Design a protein around this ligand. Structure first.
Ligand SMILES: CC(C)CCC[C@@H](C)[C@H]1CC[C@H]2[C@@H]3CC=C4C[C@@H](O)CC[C@]4(C)[C@H]3CC[C@]12C
Ligand SMILES: CC(C)CCC[C@@H](C)[C@H]1CC[C@H]2[C@@H]3CC=C4C[C@@H](O)CC[C@]4(C)[C@H]3CC[C@]12C
Ligand SMILES: CCN(CC)C(=O)[C@@H]1C=C2c3cccc4[nH]cc(c34)C[C@H]2N(C)C1
Ligand SMILES: CCCCCCCC/C=C\CCCCCCCC(=O)O
Ligand SMILES: CCCCCCCC/C=C\CCCCCCCC(=O)O
Length: 377
């Protein structure tokens, strides 16, 4: 009938998340360019989301196909449901521990005791938080996990409480922190970017000024604006090999400022002491900070459009899940179950959306997937 087009639509969704997600795990592992804590999470997230594709998602087709009668042994219906919420709790935990992590960095300035396993240590808490949450599925699992001979999370309380714990507080939390980070990190840009205007403009005046005292009043602020940038160079956590080069860059290019301040003592060589238009060093810190701003504005676009698609697709299922129990007396739960049947597969296809966002908006992801698709290393 009409269902003949949508019959296998689930299988497209099982095929995309079991594969296209899988490459994301491959790509982050194989290519050294994508070795970042915020692209580390995505790999872990991708496992949660992939694991859901090859474990939970197959049985939902078997059950949808059987008429929703439970086909398997009754003792294993409290397990398929367990993985499903675990992974789905794990999946949103990864997404919300990407904004709690990335909001943290703009609030708190900085030494890294643990280095590049700041993520792997974080990640384990993301998973072990979600395994903690899902202990109750098998704790009471073996009853209240069957309704009219279908495998269905029928515990009224877990349905209600566990919709917030694994959806509305994680997703609320991330929405809040995603937008505070954007506004905050939009602001840092303007503050840092307006310094190089000050540095260049104030250096224009020193260049074309014939009063020694004018240069003194003019070049005084060059130290200030350079320092403000120095304080404000972005976290992007803070790696051990890159921040020293900025320290040397800031310090080494501060010498030009500081030295030219003396030559205060006195204008013959003041004009030419601050000629950091001759020095290679000064030119790099523009490029290699101004790139670093644009590599955070791109990541925020992807994360916004990954957060948003994940919230907007799981939200139907959870809103009517609660409705199944918050409107127990008045709703028609042949209809709510019908609606619930289909809002999980709206939601189950947020597990495929991630890799497509990456290829669409990350040139590094795009190139590797085809190379993995074509089997090139
Ligand atoms: C059975 C319980 C633990 C529920 C979770 C399922 C299992 C399979 C979980 C437990 C801990 C998880 C791992 C924790 C550590 C890492 C390293 C990290 O950089 C990426 C994900 C990865 C590789 C996870 C993969 C999935 C994983 C092994
Ligand atoms: C996409 C998102 C916003 C979906 C929101 C779904 C929630 C708010 C709504 C949408 C569909 C709704 C159900 C639609 C139809 C019925 C049948 C009726 O006899 C009882 C109410 C009941 C069961 C509604 C309960 C509330 C409900 C579950
Ligand atoms: C149609 C019947 N099925 C299929 C197993 C469900 O109701 C599953 C149970 C859900 C569920 C209940 C209660 C709390 C929760 N947290 C996270 C989920 C969750 C995920 C959610 N999965 C997607 C489907
Ligand atoms: C659903 C069809 C699967 C097609 C796979 C496409 C690319 C082929 C890659 C291998 C699939 C399984 C990967 C397991 C080893 C991953 C390698 C690694 O990440 O270190
Ligand atoms: C920007 C958007 C980039 C994502 C590319 C498209 C990804 C798939 C989007 C959603 C489709 C799934 C919705 C219902 C699935 C039906 C089964």
């Amino acid at each position: 009938q009409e269902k003949n087009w949508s019959a296998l639509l689930t299988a497209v969704v099982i095929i995309l998340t079991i594969a296209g997600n899988i490459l994301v795990i491959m790509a982050v592992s194989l290519e050294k360019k994508l070795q970042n804590a915020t692209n580390y999470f995505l790999m872990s997230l991708a496992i949660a989301d992939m694991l859901l594709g090859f474990l939970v998602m197959p049985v939902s087709m078997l059950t949808i196909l059987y008429g929703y009668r439970w086909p398997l042994p009754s003792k294993l219906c409290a397990v398929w449901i367990y993985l499903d919420v675990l992974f789905s709790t794990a999946s949103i935990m990864h997404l919300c521990a990407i904004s709690l992590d990335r909001y943290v960095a703009i609030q708190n300035p900085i030494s890294r005791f643990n280095s590049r396993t700041k993520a792997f240590l974080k990640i384990i808490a993301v998973w072990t938080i979600s395994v903690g949450i899902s202990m109750p599925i098998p704790v009471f699992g073996l009853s209240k996990v069957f309704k009219e001979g279908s495998c269905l999370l029928a515990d009224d309380n877990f349905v209600l409480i566990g919709s917030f714990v694994s959806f509305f507080i994680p997703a609320t939390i991330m929405v809040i922190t995603y937008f505070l980070t954007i506004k905050s990190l939009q602001k840092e840009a303007a503050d840092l970017e307006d310094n190089w205007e000050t540095l260049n403009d104030n250096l224009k005046v020193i260049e074309k000024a014939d009063n020694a005292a004018q240069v003194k009043d003019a070049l005084t602020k060059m130290r200030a604006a350079a320092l403000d940038a120095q304080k404000a160079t972005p976290p992007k956590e803070d790696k051990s090999p890159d921040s020293p080069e900025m320290k040397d860059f800031r310090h080494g290019f501060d010498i030009l400022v500081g030295q030219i301040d003396d030559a205060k003592l006195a204008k013959e060589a003041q004009a030419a002491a601050e000629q950091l238009k001759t020095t290679r060093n000064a030119y790099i810190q523009k490029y290699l900070t101004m790139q670093s701003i644009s590599n955070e504005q791109k990541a925020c676009k992807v994360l916004g459009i990954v957060f948003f698609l994940f919230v907007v697709m799981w939200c139907p299922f959870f809103i009517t899940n609660i409705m199944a129990v918050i409107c127990k007396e008045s709703c028609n739960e042949d209809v709510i179950g019908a609606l619930l049947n289909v809002f999980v597969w709206i939601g189950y296809a947020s597990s495929a959306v991630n890799p497509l966002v990456y290829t669409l908006f990350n040139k590094t992801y795009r190139s590797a997937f085809s190379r993995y698709i074509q089997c090139q290393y």
